[PDB]
Design a protein around this motif. Sequence first.
Motif, PDB file in Angstrom:
ATOM      1  N   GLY B  25       0.857  -1.179   0.000  1.00  0.00           N
ATOM      2  CA  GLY B  25       0.000   0.000   0.000  1.00  0.00           C
ATOM      3  C   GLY B  25       0.890   1.225   0.000  1.00  0.00           C
ATOM      4  N   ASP B  56     -10.452  -3.719   2.684  1.00  0.00           N
ATOM      5  CA  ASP B  56      -9.264  -4.080   3.458  1.00  0.00           C
ATOM      6  C   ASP B  56      -9.282  -3.342   4.785  1.00  0.00           C
ATOM      7  OD1 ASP B  56      -5.623  -3.954   2.868  1.00  0.00           O
ATOM      8  OD2 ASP B  56      -6.856  -5.307   4.082  1.00  0.00           O
ATOM      9  N   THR B  59      -3.850  -5.190   6.536  1.00  0.00           N
ATOM     10  CA  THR B  59      -3.016  -5.430   5.343  1.00  0.00           C
ATOM     11  C   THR B  59      -2.210  -6.727   5.374  1.00  0.00           C
ATOM     12  OG1 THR B  59      -1.166  -4.040   6.136  1.00  0.00           O
ATOM     13  CG2 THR B  59      -2.830  -2.977   4.719  1.00  0.00           C
ATOM     14  N   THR B 141      -0.824  -1.480   9.791  1.00  0.00           N
ATOM     15  CA  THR B 141      -1.442  -2.653   9.184  1.00  0.00           C
ATOM     16  C   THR B 141      -2.966  -2.605   9.305  1.00  0.00           C
ATOM     17  OG1 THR B 141      -1.103  -3.974  11.197  1.00  0.00           O
ATOM     18  CG2 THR B 141       0.587  -4.110   9.490  1.00  0.00           C
TER      19      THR B 141
END
Lengths: 50, 232
Positions: B25, B56, B59, B141
């Motif tokens: 990302g 999402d 991640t 994350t």
Amino acid sequence: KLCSLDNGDCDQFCHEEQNSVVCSCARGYTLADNGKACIPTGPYPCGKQT
Amino acid sequence: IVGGQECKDGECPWQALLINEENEGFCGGTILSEFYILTAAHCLYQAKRFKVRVGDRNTEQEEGGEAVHEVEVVIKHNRFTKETYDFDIAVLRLKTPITFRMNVAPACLPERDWAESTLMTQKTGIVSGFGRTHEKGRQSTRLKMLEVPYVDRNSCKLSSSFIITQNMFCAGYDTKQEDACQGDSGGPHVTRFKDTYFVTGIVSWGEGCARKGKYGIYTKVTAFLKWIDRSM
Ligand SMILES: O=C([C@H](O)CS(=O)(=O)c1ccc2cc(Cl)ccc2c1)N1CCC(N2CCCNC2=O)CC1
Ligand SMILES: [Ca+2]
Ligand SMILES: [Ca+2]
Ligand SMILES: [Ca+2]
């Protein structure tokens, strides 16, 4: 001055035309009978949490 | 996102994540419809090729609700330059449509003059993303969100030796250690009005993250509503 206080009682967009409040809504919403509230026209309307 | 908190289930469903060729990302985006994502023009220069992940929340884990979409076409604003960061806006058309579902739904586009007068004048908005959790920090994350006050125009302009234009706005805190950061770029700034969220900003730039007397700079969506409509 009409939209300056309480958003003219509109749920979403407020404008002033010929000295009266006119409410409107985003795509995927329709104005309720009362001309103020915005009712989703389908599932997953924009700007709402799921 | 520096400070703030994790998004709860259902809470930030318009968040998109741009992922590069190494599957990392690197920028955010905002879902506008089944086919279109709003992002920053500068994000287009972080990766040659990229895809868009929706749904999402984490991640490092498979969820079973997330999907990756390829980009059909990039529509970048003609007047964006790296020198100014002015006109920092792009729209992505996806190859396949998004199916709206839990954690996947569009933000509302505001209406220009109403939003200038009634939405941009609210005390705060919300910024979200998977970016760095402090300046020099690791990316998150988990999807985070943060309430950021709108900053008055004079305090905004005076905060930087860079030119902050009419197509930009400042949000955040003078000294409180909360801000967006690298990797949040391109993502949503939304403002609530009577229980509906409208996309008001695109995370654009800052001088570092969460620095004293520095704010976050966002592309002002109201300045581009006709441009967005034409692009869509
Ligand atoms: O420091 C940075 C980076 O913006 C720092 S970052 O990547 O951590 C970053 C990114 C986006 C952010 C968004 C918000 Cl709302 C708040 C914080 C952010 C932090 N720079 C130097 C200044 C440059 N710049 C602009 C003005 C025109 N010319 C430039 O060179 C942009 C790049
Ligand atoms: Ca995931
Ligand atoms: Ca109007
Ligand atoms: Ca600051």
